[PDB]
Amino acid sequence: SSSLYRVLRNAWEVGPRSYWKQLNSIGDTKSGRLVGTDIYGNKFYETDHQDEIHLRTRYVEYKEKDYD
């Protein structure tokens, strides 16, 4: 949606630690349920909100700072 209410509600949903982590990694704020974690430690989420267009429902949160 690119609206401010989205980021504000998301930052209320997921706490400030995850906010600064998302800001330092993705560049966006995103909140959604966990689906699981792989063998390298990378966590994978999914969203249901209407605001999120196609191809932005599922996202990753890498473990290493040097993500690839």
Ligand X SMILES: CCCCCCCCCCCC(=O)OC[C@H](COP(=O)(O)OCC[N+](C)(C)C)OC(=O)CCCCCCCCCCC
Residues in contact with ligand CDL by CB under 6 A are 3-5
Tell me if 21 sits within 8 A of 30, measured CB to CB: no
Strands (E), 1-68: 33-37, 43-46, 58-61
- Pick out residues in 19-58 that bind ligand X (CB under 6 A): 24, 27
The one of ligand CDL, other proteins, ligand X, none whose footprint includes residue 57, by CB under 5 to 8 A per kind, is other proteins
Site of interaction with other proteins (CB under 8 A): 1-2, 23, 25-28, 50, 52-62, 67-68
Q: Could you give the CA distance from residue 9 to residue 35 in angstroms, rounded to a whole number?
A: 21
